[PDB]
């Protein structure tokens with residue numbers, strides 16, 4: 114069995130190996146990469162996502178989210194307070210202001226310490242989930258707006274033809290902006306490219322151990338657990354590495370830098386934070402190996418998780434017994 118300790122693997126494809134996306138995912142899985150729940154892919158030196166970022170300040174963040182925390186430093190939830198629209202140029206200047214900028218620090222480890230010590234005491238503003246792409250249309254390799262769609266994968270594997278579309282999303286971050294513990298919708302893969310700016314630190318639980326994380330989350334967030342049997346779908350709960358280690362939960366951590374891709378694998382719980390002003394692009398995708406995870410994915414039916422148009426068909430075809438209850442939650 115490859116990668117039995119479920120370590121995060123780092124790949125360096127050649128320009129030739131970067132041509133065929135599906136083939137390279139299958140290669141990484143041949144080497145056991147999926148066991149970690151997360152992999153890093155460093156693009157060949159010849160590749161570029163686009164020529165420059167000199168022209169992005171006019172992108173609109175229609176609904177910036179202020180991430181307000183409640184709890185204790187290692188175990189907290191966050192709620193998203195909607196703020197007035199602002200441009201990416203306006204947001205970058207806010208990120209760089211004295212109130213929001215990254216503090217002086219020695220290295221990534223010191224900055225991680227400061228994040229877990231002090232996150233709850235601030236409310237950073239996140240530009241999340243903005244439909245769009247920063248890949249040049251002429252970038253042919255690993256262009257997140259030109260991937261095979263999840264609807265097409267389901268049709269190729271299962272024969273069924275369904276509505277829905279699959280497009281990328283932009284994330285503009287600042288110091289302390291936070292992504293809560295979650296798996297993807299329908300336990301899909303994700304791919305995330307850090308276009309520019311400061312790093313993103315990731316934490317991940319191996320898929321084979323995901324239920325250990327869920328059981329701890331039920332203990333740590335007991336009212337949330339009574340409210341919903343899949344409350345991590347709400348994407349609001351944080352648990353620190355110190356707390357995870359105290360409770361014996363297997364996990365790993367890695368820092369993504371600008372120019373690097375991360376892949377999350379089906380049912381790989383992940384969480385993390387941004388080091389400073391940055392911009393990432395991410396999209397969900399599927400492979401044949403996903404289908405069995407899609408069929409078993411938990412679902413939020415309490416009404417909180419509220420998701421995309423395209424998830425309807427995935428529930429309806431893969432989980433027909435759950436469809437009626439889940440759709441009541443959506444409506």
Ligand SMILES: O=C(O)CNC(=O)C(=O)O
Pocket residue numbers: 284291292303304305377383393395396
């Ligand atoms: O970058 C972020 O804020 C969060 N992204 C992801 O959870 C992802 O790519 O799967």
Ligand SMILES: [Mg+2]
Pocket residue numbers: 168169170171172
């Ligand atoms: Mg612009």
Ligand code: NI
Pocket residue numbers: 295296297303377383
């Ligand atoms: Ni994710």
Ligand SMILES: [Zn+2]
Pocket residue numbers: 340341342343344346347413414415416417418
């Ligand atoms: Zn719920």
